[PDB]
Design a protein around this nucleic acid. Structure first.
Ligand SMILES: Nc1ncnc2c1ncn2[C@@H]1O[C@@H]2COP(=O)(O)O[C@H]2[C@H]1O
Ligand SMILES: Nc1ncnc2c1ncn2[C@@H]1O[C@@H]2COP(=O)(O)O[C@H]2[C@H]1O
Ligand SMILES: Nc1ncnc2c1ncn2[C@@H]1O[C@@H]2COP(=O)(O)O[C@H]2[C@H]1O
Ligand SMILES: Nc1ncnc2c1ncn2[C@@H]1O[C@@H]2COP(=O)(O)O[C@H]2[C@H]1O
Lengths: 203, 74, 203, 74, 73, 73
DNA sequence: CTAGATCACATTTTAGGAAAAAAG
DNA sequence: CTTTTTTCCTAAAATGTGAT
DNA sequence: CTAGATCACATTTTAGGAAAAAAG
DNA sequence: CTTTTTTCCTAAAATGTGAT
């Protein structure tokens, strides 16, 4: 049982987003705060040419679109797209601020999540500056075995992801992610057959 | 060690479908279960997404999960 | 006049840090929150070999070491080093939390700054994934002309920085930053003589 | 436009040192000042770090700053 | 080999798998190990999970599919 | 040229710069424009800011340093 | 295919503080 | 007189070099 | 020097939903 | 009977290829 979250939700509008739909468009005005009741989303950004880059996955429990809530007239900083199908609690910034002034605990929980994201994103920066592609991919396979939807498997953690996607995570071409997944297999570090990958030695 | 991991699987109050799969796979104690891996269980006959999900959900409500790593067993 | 910040400071221990000294060591326990009353610091991270990478500059007004404040027993996520000489307000997490429960406004101000940093750092990720070195450097010269200590100059904004440092910002070698600063000069985009660089067309 | 940018530089109450530099550089109105750039001012004789800093600080306390970009001047 | 002459039932398969073999005329374990994997998948009512159960019950008993035998029967 | 024969004072320099020239025997603007930049910096009491003031007051009047003249005086 | 990293060391450029010159 | 500017100095840090 | 990107298209692999088989 | 598992299907998405 969780008193604060239950109270928070009771002041939200719940809305279902179909798989692959866009919850947030970069550039749009920011006036609403979201909270993922069920599902998982992908936070992504794009270059001028249109190339994609996955900033982060968020899951049940995570807030979304919180960044526009502190300064007036800010714009959504990234696309947010439903990975699976999502059920999302919604509340206007204006009305959320009113909750805060009733019980600052909810703001604590939001800031907790922000702090985490900053640590995680900062690390992503280090990864890009310091590691070659093999290093970033290896790192990402370990981070993907951490996610909720990862399945336990005898040899280590089993995950479902495409080579193309991994490419959009570590910032490189899909052809390259393919070559490297094939090398990490000779080195008996992982087992790759289809979208199915067993990351040896987790769990 | 832990106290709950030695109780029979029945103390979980599963469905008839799930109960019958475990007992034909030789899983008698909750301790045997938590050690089994998710991918491993799905292969067991008559156990599909809904049963697998019921099991992961009844364990979660009781602190536990699958693929747990235990020592001194039995 | 600012009532909240004044009240906050009155519950802090003020401490002077000499130029080039370390305020925060990555890995250390996190139990204290800092606030820069005067000066400027550099937030940096390192790879195994010891190579440096400047995550961000923080200035007067900015909080530091806030990330350990939401979960218990967290570790400093990065080195923080005094760029100039700094005067820093200090308060234990424990005692800061007590302030929050007296007036949540201070927590708002902290979260505001977090949100900003997340947006800024996320962008740094995009820069690394999308831009070549010339693009990242050009971008960084524009961002450095934004800083407080940048001097206004007739042709555009004037800044003081070394090639080595720029390298640690955009994540590349110093030799390379030198070559590119020399190209951006033929293209009449900037004027570079010594540590002194005039970024044409700002202001 | 703005009302304050047309008052003489004296309404800023500067030090004798700063006042004498502006009046020998032909800066009579606050509007002339805010247009001047920081690097440009530092070259002016008898004006060093402390005076330059006093000026940037007296303008800041009054909303303004240096290197401001104005239209229709005078 | 001695085990290759026992009926398929000695493998203790599921009802689903058992019914497919008996409608494909596979009575003895020796007939099975000779059948190829691609060949079995075409047999009606036999899908990935049953095919996998069979390859797994044979593996636990030394054997596998697509084995090449002499003097049969 | 006509301007190169006027005294250095017609440039309206600072007291600091004026005193350095008059102790280096530079009376006429013509003497100045002939002097080289590296040469001037060595002269006592003349540093970056004065050297810069001089190069800037000459530039606003067409001239510069290190100019090469004939028939002098 | 190309963008960048790489190597050691002679040379250039900076920080910043005492002290002198000039202004207040 | 005092205060601010400006000179003037060197250890140490920063830099370019250019074929692979 | 090397790590990666690059190109188009024949081939492989997946998602997910109706429908059949089996268990409850 | 009802519910869950498992088969079985194809448009569409994902993939490898390898010299420069
Ligand atoms: N680096 C990041 N990590 C996790 N989530 C992010 C990151 N950057 C942006 N987001 C989320 O994406 C959202 C886009 O809209 P907002 O700016 O309102 O709020 C943003 C965050 O909720
Ligand atoms: N990406 C970032 N941008 C700005 N500041 C940061 C970033 N990452 C870490 N920091 C600061 O560096 C601090 C290191 O200690 P903390 O983890 O306590 O808190 C951290 C932040 O205050
Ligand atoms: N780094 C270097 N080391 C030795 N010789 C060089 C270098 N660069 C150019 N030459 C010639
Ligand atoms: N991408 C490609 N296009 C054409 N020919 C190729 C390619 N890769 C290998 N070959 C031969």
């Amino acid at each position: 049982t969780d008193p604060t979250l239950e109270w928070f939700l009771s002041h939200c509008h719940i809305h279902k987003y179909p798989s692959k739909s866009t919850l947030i468009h970069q550039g749009e005005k920011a006036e609403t705060l979201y909270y993922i009741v069920k599902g998982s989303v992908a936070v992504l950004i794009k270059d001028e040419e249109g190339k994609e880059m996955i900033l982060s996955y968020l899951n049940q429990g995570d807030f979304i679109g919180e960044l526009g809530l502190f300064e007036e007239g800010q714009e959504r900083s990234a696309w947010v797209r439903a990975k699976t199908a999502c059920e999302v609690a919604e509340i206007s910034y204006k009305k959320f601020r009113q909750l805060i002034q009733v019980n600052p605990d909810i703001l604590m929980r939001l800031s907790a999540q922000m702090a985490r994201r900053l640590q995680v994103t900062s690390e992503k920066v280090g990864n890009l500056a310091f590691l070659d592609v093999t290093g970033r991919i290896a790192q990402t396979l370990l981070n993907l075995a951490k996610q909720p939807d990862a399945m336990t498997h005898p040899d280590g953690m089993q995950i479902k992801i495409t080579r193309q996607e991994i490419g959009q995570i570590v910032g490189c071409s899909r052809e390259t992610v393919g070559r490297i997944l094939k090398m990490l297999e000779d080195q008996n570090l992982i087992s790759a057959h289809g979208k199915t990958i067993v990351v040896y030695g987790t769990r | 060690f832990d106290p709950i991991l030695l109780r029979p699987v029945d103390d979980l109050e599963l469905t008839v479908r799930s109960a019958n799969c475990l007992k034909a796979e030789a899983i008698h104690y909750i301790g045997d279960l938590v050690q089994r891996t998710e991918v491993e269980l799905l292969k067991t006959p008559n156990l599909g997404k809904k049963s697998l999900t019921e099991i992961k959900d009844v364990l979660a409500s009781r602190g536990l999960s699958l693929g747990m790593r235990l020592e001194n067993w039995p």
